[PDB]
């Protein structure tokens, strides 16, 4: 009867086209502002002093870029970790010079993605679902907050944060290799196993369902039209695909349970990306990966090279060349 | 300096295959409106 109850009834209605919910009250204003500023800053945005040395790096399309090289540049080294909104900038020209829109996009992104995650919970509550799709979405939220939030914190500047682009991503990955040795760190190892394993069990499960489909169509029409939507009959012989994989490797390595099978597809990647995103986090605070340089010696004591020493000389090439003007002192403490 | 044959590569790489996929949809809906027998078959 009241105005608030007629507003709570609408905002929590599943009869809307898109469910809004109470998290959409701060998902939609956040992500539309992260979007509408990203499209403008990617297309039309002046160059940005990223190294704090007043050498402005172009990143937008109107200043001679493309899809690959164009990128929303991170904020300045001069700012660093300080909060830099528009009203604390004394003009928009001073805001866009010093890496303004990187903080406006990222902070409205991480609020909107952490609200998109809670929104996946909310609709599962109002639909009668068991709730935990949003726990599986915690794994890219862990990884998005690792390269945009946690790594600028432990390194003390948003300038070490990830550039919102495509070539800026590979500037981020290579400089992160030289300074932290991520490939030898066992948490990037535990998530390469998460996505190689994840793409394995995806294409391994998706093939054994498509292999054992039941005849419901003719050879002229499509294979997919043998599934009517909302039917109650099972659309594939699960005993058939169990007997196949029960002979392809051996018998006891096969899940006859389809529920425990469809749980292992959700376990393996998500655990692999939780562990990986806490690799960037523990390497944000300079707890680097393994270092086996000069580890094998002869009885005389001369250093015998290994593959890690060849990997070290690739890291030394990126270390002596990243931010080639920003350094003045012999050790990259930042 | 960009290659001036790339405009012909991209804008025909967009339009010619994308206008192809539109045609397979329009004749799909015409066959469905063709069999249905009401007001649109002719």
């Amino acid at each position: 009867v009241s105005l608030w109850e007629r507003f709570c009834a609408w905002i929590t209605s599943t009869e809307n086209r898109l469910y809004i919910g109470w998290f959409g009250c701060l998902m939609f204003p956040t992500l539309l502002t992260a979007t509408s500023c990203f499209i403008i800053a990617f297309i039309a945005a002046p160059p940005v002093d990223i190294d704090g040395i007043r050498e402005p790096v172009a990143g937008s399309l109107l200043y001679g870029n493309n899809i690959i090289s164009g990128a929303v540049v991170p904020s300045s080294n001069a700012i660093g970790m300080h909060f830099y909104p528009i009203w604390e900038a004394a003009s928009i020209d001073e805001w866009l010079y010093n890496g303004g829109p990187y903080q406006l996009i990222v902070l409205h992104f991480l609020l909107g993605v952490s609200a998109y995650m809670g929104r996946e919970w909310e609709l599962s509550y109002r639909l009668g679902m068991r709730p935990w799709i949003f726990v599986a979405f915690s794994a890219p939220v862990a990884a998005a907050s690792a390269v945009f939030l946690v790594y600028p914190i432990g390194q003390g500047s948003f300038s070490d944060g990830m550039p919102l682009g495509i070539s800026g991503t590979f500037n981020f990955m290579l400089v992160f290799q030289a300074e932290h040795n991520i490939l030898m760190h066992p948490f990037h190892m535990a998530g390469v196993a998460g996505v190689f394993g994840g793409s394995l069990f995806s294409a391994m499960h998706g093939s054994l369902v498509t292999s054992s489909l039941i005849r419901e169509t003719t050879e002229n029409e499509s294979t997919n039209y043998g599934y009517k939507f909302g039917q109650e009959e099972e659309t594939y012989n699960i005993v058939a695909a169990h007997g196949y994989f029960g002979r392809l490797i051996f018998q006891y390595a096969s899940f006859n349970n389809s529920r425990a099978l469809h749980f292992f597809l959700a376990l393996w990647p998500v655990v692999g990306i939780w562990i990986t995103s806490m690799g960037i986090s523990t390497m944000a605070f300079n707890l680097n990966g393994f270092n086996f340089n000069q580890s094998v010696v002869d009885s005389q004591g001369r250093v015998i090279n290994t593959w890690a020493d060849i990997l070290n000389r690739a890291n030394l090439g990126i270390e002596v060349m990243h931010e080639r003007n920003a350094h003045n002192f012999p050790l990259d403490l930042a | 300096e960009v290659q001036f044959g790339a405009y012909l590569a991209v804008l025909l790489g967009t339009f010619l295959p994308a206008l192809f996929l539109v045609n397979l949809f329009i004749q799909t809906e015409a066959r469905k409106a063709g069999k249905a027998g009401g007001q649109d078959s002719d």
Binding site: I43, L61, N65, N66, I67, G230 | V2, V10, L11
Partner: peptide, 30 residues
């Protein structure tokens, strides 16, 4: 002149995302 093509590809991609969400073929039981 060159960046005009890149912008048209980007907003043209966001058009077909708009039509796929709102003008989707709504699936129906029976």
């Amino acid at each position: 002149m060159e960046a005009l093509v890149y912008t048209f590809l980007l907003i043209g991609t966001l058009m077909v995302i708009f039509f796929a969400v709102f003008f989707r073929e709504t699936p129906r039981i029976l």
